[PDB]
């Protein structure tokens, strides 16, 4: 149990990042095999950290 | 500031923009269907178009403009993260600039060494101590000096430029900034001319989803098609060799005689009728000849006839078609079987459908409330801003699980309640 | 679209070889002003099983002639044996 923020949960429903979520399903529910598809997760989770920087300076 | 203010504003709003730029590429294509020939343009509705044609030509152009600065800097430091991160951890772990050196495959893989050198390699990859980890690393086996050689109005020659050409040389690799630039001057050459200004229609196929699906179609199904289009203009030239030795004399484009008649029997110009007119007849190649009346050649006509017909027209001609009707049902199958293996099973604990039915409306539950890849998302960014002695026993030991890039941590198969209850 | 896209190529590069006159005894009719060329091809090259090579007339000896017959091709299976029948491909479906 953790605590999402205020300002996290907005940019999140922002149409900016919501794009690069459907883009990102798009690709690992075709190939790729389970035993790697966390690993390209969290390659997904370290770059969508770096829209939000972008939508905060908005 | 206002520059500023009015750069973000374009970054803000940009599928918003492009959206509309279709709609306008739209206006000029049914307005320029209003020609007659000089080429001019008439009226029915408004008494002006001349007007409209020449706004909408300028309005088109610079939003084609506001896209390709909208997208400088909306996608671009995307495109400048996720290339400099895989430069960072492939200089890291195994150093390929140190130890593999990359050979002539994969260029843009050897184009990162203009960027090596300068200062500010971590730019944005929140990680500055690429240079100094693999001096710390690496300096047992190669030589420290040899790494700081190999890493190391005012403002106009006081900026880093061997940045910034390896930063241009990023960019243009990129297939999305091709294609905006391509669009771009796609609208300043139909400035030009018109006619080659409708090829702003191509946005309608290059999407996003009915783009990858049709790179996906034609690496499943090209190498079937091209040699089923290549299986054609073999049994057609099998034919031309048939009806060039054996059958010559029966072409004519004469009105009896009295044109000087023209032949169709040459080396290539029976071959060349044969693929323009026999495929495109309905009746074969039984259409464009004459009749069989009376010749010694009668009974071997009408099997060249019946032959041709029923080997190219009714066979080879559909398993053609069949392919792709069938080639464009995986361009509805594909984009719906995306839609529907993410609803059977869940994305990271991967149970599967049934499994939160059996309690009344779980799966929603199941997936909303306890594992929702969003949620996800917002722990690792809680550890980021959370500071290293407050953490707890579960979220020191992911994050020093996180660092040592193990990803054993996630519930594989085995979630919540199906070990509980 | 792709009807269109070939209405801009025929009237552009392509325009003279539209006839409907018994060899210049009528005073000629034209199919190449603006839409005249698209409500032709669109009217007659759709249904005619032929693609557009059966209301028109012969390439010769023409300078265009090479051009004439990739024209004369394309046009066939990519509007006729292909658009048209995966229209025909999903009624047949949408009945089923
Ligand atoms: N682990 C998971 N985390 C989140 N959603 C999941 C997971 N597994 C499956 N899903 C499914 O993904 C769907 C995503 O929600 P939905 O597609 O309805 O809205 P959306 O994501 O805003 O739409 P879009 O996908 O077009 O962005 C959910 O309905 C959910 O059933
Ligand atoms: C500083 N920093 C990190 O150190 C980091 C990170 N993601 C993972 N790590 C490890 N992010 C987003 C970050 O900003
Ligand atoms: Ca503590
Ligand atoms: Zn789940």
Known sequence: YFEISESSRTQWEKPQVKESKRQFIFDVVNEGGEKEKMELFVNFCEDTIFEMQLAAQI | ?421
């Not at chain 2, 000087?260 to 009746?283: I, N, Q």
């Not at chain 2, 306890?370 to 949620?375: D, G, I, K, Q, V």
């Not at chain 2, 660092?403 to 085995?414: I, K, S």
């Open chain 2, 1 to 421: 500031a206002y520059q500023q203010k009015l750069l973000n504003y374009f970054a803000r709003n940009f599928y918003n923009m492009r959206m509309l730029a279709l709609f306008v590429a739209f206006a000029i294509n049914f307005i320029l269907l209003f020609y007659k020939v000089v080429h001019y343009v008439l009226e029915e509705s408004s008494g002006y178009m001349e007007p409209t044609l020449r706004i909408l030509a300028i309005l088109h152009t610079v939003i084609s403009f506001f896209c390709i600065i909208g997208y400088y800097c909306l996608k671009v430091p995307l495109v400048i993260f996720k290339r400099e991160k895989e430069v960072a951890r492939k200089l890291e772990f195994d150093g390929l600039y140190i130890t593999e050196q990359p050979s002539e495959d994969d260029i843009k893989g050897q184009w990162d060494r203009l960027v090596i050198n300068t200062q500010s390699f971590p730019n944005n990859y929140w990680d500055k101590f690429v240079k100094r980890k693999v001096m710390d690393k690496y300096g047992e086996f190669y030589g420290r000096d040899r790494i700081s050689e190999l890493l190391g109005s005012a403002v106009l020659n006081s900026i880093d430029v061997k940045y910034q050409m390896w930063k241009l040389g990023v960019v243009f690799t990129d297939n999305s900034f091709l294609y905006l630039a391509w669009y771009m001057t796609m609208s300043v050459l139909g400035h030009y001319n018109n006619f080659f200004f409708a090829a702003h229609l191509l946005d309608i196929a290059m999407g996003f989803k009915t783009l990858r699906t049709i790179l996906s179609s034609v690496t499943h199904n090209g190498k079937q098609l091209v040699l089923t289009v290549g299986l054609l203009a073999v049994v057609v030239y099998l034919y031309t060799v048939v009806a060039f030795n054996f059958f010559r004399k029966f072409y004519n484009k004469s009105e009896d005689g009295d044109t000087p008649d023209m032949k169709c029997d040459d080396m290539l110009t029976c071959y060349m009728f044969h693929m323009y007119v026999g495929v495109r007849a309905g009746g074969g190649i039984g259409d464009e000849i004459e009749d069989p009346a009376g010749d010694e050649y009668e009974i071997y006509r009408i099997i060249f006839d019946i032959t041709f017909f029923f080997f190219v027209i009714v066979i080879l001609l559909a398993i053609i078609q069949g392919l792709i009707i069938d080639a464009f049902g995986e361009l509805r199958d594909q984009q719906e079987q995306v839609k529907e293996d993410m609803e059977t099973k869940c994305f990271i604990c991967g149970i599967g459908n049934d499994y939160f039915d059996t309690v009344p409306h779980g799966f929603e539950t199941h997936t909303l409330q306890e594992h929702n890849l969003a949620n996800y998302l917002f722990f690792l960014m809680y550890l980021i801003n959370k500071d290293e002695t407050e953490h707890t026993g579960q979220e020191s030991y992911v994050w020093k699980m996180y660092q040592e890039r193990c990803w054993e941590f996630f519930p594989a198969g085995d979630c919540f309640r199906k070990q509980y209850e």
